[PDB]
Amino acid sequence: APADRLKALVDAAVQPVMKANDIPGLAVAISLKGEPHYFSYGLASKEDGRRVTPETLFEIGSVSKTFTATLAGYALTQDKMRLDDRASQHWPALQGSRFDGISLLDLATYTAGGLPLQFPDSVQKDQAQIRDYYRQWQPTYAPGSQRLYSNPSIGLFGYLAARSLGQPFERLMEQQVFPALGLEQTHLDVPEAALAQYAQGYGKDDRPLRVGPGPLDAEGYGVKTSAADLLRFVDANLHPERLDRPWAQALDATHRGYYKVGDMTQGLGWEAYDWPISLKRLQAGNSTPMALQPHRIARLPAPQALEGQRLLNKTGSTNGFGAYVAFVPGRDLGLVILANRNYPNAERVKIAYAILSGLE
Ligand SMILES: *[B@@]1([O])O[C]([C]C([O])=O)C2=C1[C]=C(OC1=[C]N=[C][C]=N1)C([C])=C2[C]
Fold first, then answer.
1. Are 348 and 315 in contact, with CB atoms under 8 Å apart?
2. Is the CB of 129 within 6 Å of ligand 1?
3. Biggest alpha carbon–alpha carbon distance for the chain
4. Any idea what the Cα angle at residue 155 is, between residues 269 and 84, rounded to 5°?
5. Distance in angstroms (rounded) separating the CA atoms of residues 69 and 158
6. E strand or H helix at 300, and its extent?
7. Domains in the chain, please, with CATH?
8. Which residue, 117, 165, 328, 353, is the most exposed by fewest CB within 10 angstroms?
């Protein structure tokens, strides 16, 4: 039967990668021809034997950047900001700093001039420390020239988008974004009543790891969600026209490419590839050098619609978790893979590619 073939395909993609990477628990959700399919494996917590289900909450790390991009898309639709605004327009504390010469687009797409991967360990989760960090920062190279993947960069983009809307970022996400997207199992701060669903994360020697507080954590990497809710977010990305118009436009704003680095076209949050493309090329686009090294960009003459025969994706990790999301707009196909180990991105893409190739 078709259910046996689909389970065989997903099990064959997942099971060897879970064993090889010692992943305790993993949830898959697939959207195929307008229908959801869930496959759950292993344990959300090894110690109490709680099994993974499509409702288990996982940390999705930098997949959160696609939610941040959606909130910024909403601020853009409301005309509260423009991508070509100077960053300091939205935060007076930054007036007179180098952010007078950096656009919101540069922050969103990691091209502001060398903002680092992480905030320095000296910057705690404190408004004054974050403010002072940005006031004193000076670019290593010209804005708009080199991409250096960065939590302070897109984190400031999200923070400024929230300021443009006159409310804190976390509040806008809880009170407006998640409800508009129909997401009731998606959190920045997991409620006490939902804690029984929160998987344990595992690191070296199975040390337990759940994400701790950090500066602009919500904007950069702070979402916890289930495979079922993350697939609902993928389905909203596949069909923005099904949402009320302002939210449809917010999602559309995340489907616009601004420049290329190798095979990857950078949108707001989402990273896109031509589809089909080899597995080795998709792994290279999601590789450690893409996260850690600067790359010169090839700017597009106009923003490009990220639709049709393309694969849009994002990896996300925390110390204890490893997520991957991918969708193909022109095929009405979406996939989520959530795990409670930070296992190599190449292995996440390997599972996804085996599934997507087998569905085809
Ligand atoms: B984010 O999850 O994207 C990358 C990792 C990946 O999967 O591509 C990344 C992200 C955040 C991040 O900082 C961080 C992560 N967890 C906790 C605290 N900070 C880093 C360092 C990286 C590489």
1. yes
2. no
3. 66
4. 70
5. 7
6. strand 298-305
7. 1-360 (3.40.710.10)
8. 117
d(CA 54, CA 338): 10
**Cα separation of 220 and 215, whole Å?**
9
215 φ/ψ angles, rounded to the nearest 5 degrees: -60, 130
Could you tell me the two tokens for 9? Answer: 């395909």
Strand partners, 273: 311
Contact 212, 152 (CB under 8 A): no
Q: Of 342, 299, 306, which Cα lies nearest the Cα of 323?
A: 342
Cα(315)–Cα(265) distance, integer angstroms:
15
**CB of 320 shorter than 6 A to ligand 1:** no
Quote the tokens at residue 28: 């898959």
Pocket of ligand 1 contains residue 61 by CB under 6 Å: yes
- CB neighbourhood size of 8 (10 A): 11
Place of tokens 């759940």: 210
User: For this experimental structure, what is the resolution in angstroms?
Assistant: 1.3
Q: State which ligand 1 atom lies nearest to the alpha carbon of 65.
A: 1
User: Which secondary-structure segment (H or E) carries 32?
Assistant: strand 25-32
Q: Are 301 and 287 in contact (CB under 8 A)?
A: no
Cross-strand partners of 30? 37, 335
Strands (E), 167-247: 186-187, 224-225
149 known ligand binder: yes
Method: X-ray
